[PDB]
Amino acid sequence: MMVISEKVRKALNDQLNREIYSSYLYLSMATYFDAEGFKGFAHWMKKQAQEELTHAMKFYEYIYERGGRVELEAIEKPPSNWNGIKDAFEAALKHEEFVTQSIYNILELASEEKDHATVSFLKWFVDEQVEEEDQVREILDLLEKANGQMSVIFQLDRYLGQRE
Amino acid sequence: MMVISEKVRKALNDQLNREIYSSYLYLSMATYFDAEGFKGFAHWMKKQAQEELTHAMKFYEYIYERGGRVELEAIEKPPSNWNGIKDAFEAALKHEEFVTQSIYNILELASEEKDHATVSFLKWFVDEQVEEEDQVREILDLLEKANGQMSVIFQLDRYLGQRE
Amino acid sequence: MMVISEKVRKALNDQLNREIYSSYLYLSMATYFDAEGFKGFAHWMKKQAQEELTHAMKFYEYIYERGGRVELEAIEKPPSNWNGIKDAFEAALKHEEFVTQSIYNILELASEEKDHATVSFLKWFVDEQVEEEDQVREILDLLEKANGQMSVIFQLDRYLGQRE
Amino acid sequence: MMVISEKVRKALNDQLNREIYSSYLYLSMATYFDAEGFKGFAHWMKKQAQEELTHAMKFYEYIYERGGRVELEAIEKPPSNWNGIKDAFEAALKHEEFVTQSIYNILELASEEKDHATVSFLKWFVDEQVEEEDQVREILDLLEKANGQMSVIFQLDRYLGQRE
Amino acid sequence: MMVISEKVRKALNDQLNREIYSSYLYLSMATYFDAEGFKGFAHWMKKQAQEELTHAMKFYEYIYERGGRVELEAIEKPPSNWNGIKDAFEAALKHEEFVTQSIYNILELASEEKDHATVSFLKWFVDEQVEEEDQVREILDLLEKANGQMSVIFQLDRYLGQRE
Amino acid sequence: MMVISEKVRKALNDQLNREIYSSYLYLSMATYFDAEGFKGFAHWMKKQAQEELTHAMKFYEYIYERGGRVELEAIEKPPSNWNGIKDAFEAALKHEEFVTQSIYNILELASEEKDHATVSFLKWFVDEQVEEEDQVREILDLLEKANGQMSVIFQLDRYLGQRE
Ligand SMILES: [Ca+2]
Ligand SMILES: [Ca+2]
Ligand SMILES: [Ca+2]
Ligand SMILES: [Ca+2]
Ligand SMILES: [Ca+2]
Ligand SMILES: [Ca+2]
Ligand SMILES: [Ca+2]
Ligand SMILES: [Fe+3]
Ligand SMILES: [Fe+3]
Ligand SMILES: [Fe+3]
Ligand SMILES: [Fe+3]
Ligand SMILES: [Fe+3]
Ligand SMILES: [Fe+3]
Ligand SMILES: [Fe+3]
Ligand SMILES: [Fe+3]
Ligand SMILES: [Fe+3]
Ligand SMILES: [Fe+3]
Ligand SMILES: [Fe+3]
Ligand SMILES: [Fe+3]
């Protein structure tokens, strides 16, 4: 039997599909950075796309552990172009903040239903969104300092290109 | 400057998006196998989904190597249900055969344009599809022989669950 | 001096004795499986009994860390017979769900008292109960596929019999 | 089929439940030592509790080895308050001597029925009881010599807290 | 941009400065223990002072991760004398309970604002205050047993002087 | 019995408290570098804050070695903002030179009282201050040559961020 409500299952399944789109959106940013010839920024975005899949699969696992089932939905076409490196990371930040609020909405839903298991499960994502948002903000602040200057941009590209 | 034609770039880009859908489809099969309590078959499908992403990234890399750009498209909602283990693997064989013909069409289009670079590049995928189809056929033959004997199905699930 | 309320200390002490009974209940299931000649299912239940003692000792330590004292209560006699292997694991699942709800009751009591320490302490058990219930549901699902087939049940017995 | 008599099976089963109570009694002494702030004495009692469970499981194995079956009974509530350190260990000695006589009674019963297998099996517990009693007598003699001296009690607590 | 409210930022910053004062308070207790010739107690306090600084730096990091800024405030002069070792640990316990309640007040503030990131971040400190209070309570209980006796106090001094 | 004069003990104690303030000042400079997004400069200041604590503890241990006692005093609130990176390090140089003169003043006071042990103890701090001032002057020189060039400032931030 399923021991999460259908409302909570739908919220979690929706979020899993949102993590899939996040992976896809960051791959799309990679296609933009590669088109612009910044392979280190593109590498960072390919690593980011893989990271989002690990998020999706943690939602996947929990849904089945609570007796639910995962339904994959259509993935919408992401944008494929941004107006410079900074613009792409600014869209990344607005996306991560939207993901954070999406996760907050599940937490308050599960809290209202006294679904302590799901509330507790979501703590890891609450903490991970803090780091996710900070990692983008950190890059945005370095890009602000870089201004338009290619010598600094190249430094960031090499540094981000080392992401493990 | 792009040294593949736009027609070949489009066909390669379509195939990249088709490998992405292939990954999504096999994840969908995993959701079905997990829902049915067959974690070993689900594990195999999750590994298959990752194998398809390596195919997509090989197309990704070739497109940029020839001066083109990748555009990610919407990904259709995959089926989420099958009438049994055999039915899902039969659908996988059909999907792989379709991928093989899709690759064939690019090969023939590249050949008519005398794009020997792309023709040569696709040889890897031609040989990989022979193996991809064979690996599903092998599993189908095992399921056929098992008939419906759960004891043998349990062993197959465990075996496929050891996929590296 | 004690820094949990007496109401919370009693709720935690009750839950400790509840975990001791759970251990005893699972050892009793071991006596049934050994009586039926399923040493692998018995082995799994003996490991489960030890696992419940580790739960009891975690409540033990926290009670003393909060300046409380533990008082052991009489342990009721458990059932010693079930109507087949599946009926015993169904009894185990229902028992775990009652354990989960008992823990939820402590969590809501502590939360009402603004005993943030005990609320936080109980998160570990909220998460463990997710896993505890899932581990039983997984065996139940495998038993349902086994139907009655001794060839399948032999496989399950040897698989569970290797639990570490 | 069972090759011990029911009278011998019941006696062995009674002793198994008696060893479970012994383990519970020693855990209760630990709750007392922990309440009094003697973690080393409490550690010794937790170790003793686990040692008693190995005794119970030896009776468990032997009962099934002779075709019998184990029935777990209710476990009585142990005392939880002693006058002081030495009184707890004196209660342990009297309990171990009661356990020894209880084993003597099974030996004489099995001997009267010419159940030489059960008589032989019990030799290990006879020899183990000599050591069990001796190990408590040694601690009692240290506590008697200590008289009330807290500095000695501290060293004894620390020594016993090292039990493997 | 700062994604904690100014009310929560100020509560976190206040607490950072309280952990700094806590470090300075324990260093002062070390100056007292060293003046009294108890180098083991002094060593424990120097280690405690470093431990408090790790708490301050965790608040520091989280404030910057949420886009806030740390402002260091004046540090008040601590007491430098106590009426014996036991009086000093009584003051330590009083101080830790005040730190615990200070953390609870932040938790309830962030909960009221639905600042789930800060609520979750604070769980680590809720759990650590449980241990912090218990470690002082333990030493106080042993000093109560010691009464005045130098033979017991020398044991505590050398044991605490092994703190890593 | 204290074998330094009270005047020398107070001068040594004043200096200990000034090394504590130095630590706190450098931590405040870290808060400023972190606010400005230069984590490598902040790291260097955090390491510098720890170094000043080792200076404080050397004064601590010598005071007790000579039979004296340490009294911790209030710590003034440090500045928390500077007019750029160079302005912060110039405040650091000025503070280090003030620390050197402060040490010179103790040396001359002890020399006047013929406290050869304290004069000799201070030689280490005389030599360390030479290095301390020079390490700041070296960074100031690199900043002067860097002028405003963000490209160079990025490299200096990363270099100083390697400080062990
Ligand atoms: Ca990340
Ligand atoms: Ca393959
Ligand atoms: Ca388990
Ligand atoms: Ca023994
Ligand atoms: Ca710890
Ligand atoms: Ca601690
Ligand atoms: Ca230095
Ligand atoms: Fe994510
Ligand atoms: Fe993300
Ligand atoms: Fe493929
Ligand atoms: Fe394929
Ligand atoms: Fe449990
Ligand atoms: Fe359980
Ligand atoms: Fe025994
Ligand atoms: Fe015994
Ligand atoms: Fe602290
Ligand atoms: Fe503390
Ligand atoms: Fe210094
Ligand atoms: Fe300095």
Author numbering:
A (entry chain C), B (entry chain F), C (entry chain D), D (entry chain A), E (entry chain B), F (entry chain H): 1 to 164
Pull verbatim passages from the article behind this deposition.
This study focuses on TmFtn, a naturally dimeric protein consisting of two antiparallel four helix bundles, as shown in Supplementary Fig. 1. Thermotoga maritima ferritin (TmFtn) naturally occurs as a dimer; twelve of these dimers interact with each other in a head-to-side manner to generate 24-meric hollow protein nanocage in the presence of Ca2+ or PEG. By tuning two contiguous dimeric proteins to interact in a fully or partially side-by-side fashion through protein interface redesign, we can render the self-assembly transformation of such dimeric building blocks from the protein nanocage to filament, nanorod and nanoribbon in response to multiple external stimuli.
Consistent with these recent findings, our results show that, in solution, purified TmFtn molecules exist as dimers and can self-assemble into 24-meric hollow protein nanocage in the presence of Ca2+, and addition of EDTA causes the formed protein nanocage disassembly back into its dimeric form, indicative of a reversible process of protein assembly. The crystal structure of 24-meric Tmftn determined at a resolution of 2.2 Å shows that one calcium ion located nearby C3–C4 interface is coordinated with two acidic residues (Glu51 and Glu132) and three water molecules. This might be an important reason why TmFtn molecules naturally exist as protein dimers in solution in the absence of metal ions. Based on these findings, it is reasonable to believe that calcium ions facilitate the interaction of these protein dimers in a head-to-side manner, resulting in the formation of hollow protein nanocage.
